[PDB]
């Protein structure tokens, strides 16, 4: 296994409404500005905020700004507002496998992709979770899968292109996850096998276009608990 390590040394920030908050991120090597930012709201949902270091995505308020180059990047929020609360994660899109920082949870001081429901299984078993896309670009988009454990940032599992069934996997999950897709029902599936407590996490599906190295839209996530 080989990758570019992303780190957000500051895991949590406590601030007041109106402050100027900054979230920092470092890549282990030059990622040539291919650095994206996501905000995970308290309800667990994830939204794509900035692409290629500074490109705000449609709808994102002007108070947000991205800076950086080389290995160091930052997201700045001017005039902090309540809706900005959540956990911010950086992600380099320069070199597969895509990698994410550990996230920085921001607190105040004193879906088009519908995934199947929560799973609860025993060690050694397998589970198949689904992700139905109600949109119309399912077969012409990469469907990515991401793993999140408490305090374990976010890990890119792999992706599949429904159009021709092509698939790419993160070496770390090759024997663990199997990605498939049904063109007719616009549904992508991920089967996890030989489950251990390490597989206990929330898994998200997220699609991306064929030319941008970021996850455009995210499902709500599926919780998988492995229990003895």
Q: What labels describe this entry?
A:
monomeric; mainly beta; monoclonal antibody; single-chain FV; immune system; Immunoglobulin-like; 2 domains; 228 residues; seven-stranded mixed beta sheet; immunoglobulin; 22 strands
Layout of secondary structure:
Elements: E1 6-7, E2 12-15, E3 21-27, E4 35-40, E5 46-51, E6 55-56, E7 64-69, E8 72-77, E9 86-92, E10 99-100, E11 104-108, E12 113-115, E13 119-121, E14 127-133, E15 142-148, E16 155-161, E17 166-169, E18 177-182, E19 187-192, E20 201-208, E21 217-218, E22 222-226
Parallel strand pairs: 2-11, 13-22
Antiparallel strand pairs: 1-3, 3-8, 4-5, 4-9, 5-6, 7-8, 9-10, 9-11, 12-14, 14-19, 15-16, 15-20, 16-17, 18-19, 20-21, 20-22
How is this structure best described in words?
The protein has strands at residues 6-7, 12-15, 21-27, 35-40, 46-51, 55-56, 64-69, 72-77, 86-92, 99-100, 104-108, 113-115, 119-121, 127-133, 142-148, 155-161, 166-169, 177-182, 187-192, 201-208, 217-218, 222-226. The chain is mainly beta. It folds into two domains: 1-112, Immunoglobulins (Immunoglobulin-like); 113-218, Immunoglobulins (Immunoglobulin-like, Sandwich). The protein is globular, with a radius of gyration of 17 Å. It starts with 5 loop residues before the first strand and ends with a strand. It is classed as immune system. The entry lists the keywords monoclonal antibody, immunoglobulin. The assembly is monomeric.
